[PDB]
Amino acid sequence: EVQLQQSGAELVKPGASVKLSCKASGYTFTSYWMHWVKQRPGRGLEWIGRIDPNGGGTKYNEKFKSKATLTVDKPSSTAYMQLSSLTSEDSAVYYCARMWYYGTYYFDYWGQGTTLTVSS
């Protein structure tokens, strides 16, 4: 209210490719920009990228660009993150957050974060 929705937990194994989602109550992404924050103890929070549902335009870091990925199910209201070829250090709790800056209006609201378990 306005609330954002990710899955509890997902299980994957090294070398496999998994995808996490972020919905809006909401109604739909785009527009209300998308984030993916990674949380691994002490480290706390990492970043990843964004996606332009209307027709593409993602942005990450020199390190993320391989595994990184950002997307949507515009005919519904979903946003997506894909870790291709996961590793045991991919394991973590990735947060999704929207909106703006691009700058619609005018603050993020967090999800709960999916526990990515890798692997056994």
Binding site: E1, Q3, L4, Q5, Q6, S7, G8, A9, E10, S21, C22, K23, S25, S76, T78, C96, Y109, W110, G111, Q112, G113, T114
Partner: protein, 110 residues
């Protein structure tokens, strides 16, 4: 294969109304999915709240109600209390087994 999707969390305040949703990746959720909402509380404590889309378990106020909205199953919570703060998983029936969503975590302030 069957993947269930729900919101990863929703926040709220006591007295408000929050709806949680549940969608199947093989089509529309339907009555033969017998959508269940089982409440989970800290230390892995699990309690079936609603089943068969709209059926309340014993000891559950009718503040909790479930339904099908379009192609999604929904759990609505009315007059949200503090005690409700919990994870709300969706478990759908596909012929002979159960598939679980990742669980929607609902918070109050407080």
């Amino acid at each position: 294969q069957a993947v269930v999707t729900q919101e990863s969390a929703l926040t709220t305040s006591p007295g408000e109304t929050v709806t949680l949703t549940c969608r199947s990746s093989t089509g529309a959720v339907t009555t033969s999915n017998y959508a269940n909402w089982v409440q989970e509380k800290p230390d892995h404590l699990f309690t079936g709240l609603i089943g068969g889309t709209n059926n309340r378990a014993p000891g559950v106020p009718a503040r909790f109600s479930g339904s099908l909205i379009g192609n999604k199953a929904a759990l609505t919570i009315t007059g949200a209390q503090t005690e409700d703060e919990a994870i709300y998983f969706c478990a759908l029936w596909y012929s002979n087994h159960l598939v679980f969503g990742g669980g929607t975590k609902l918070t109050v302030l407080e």
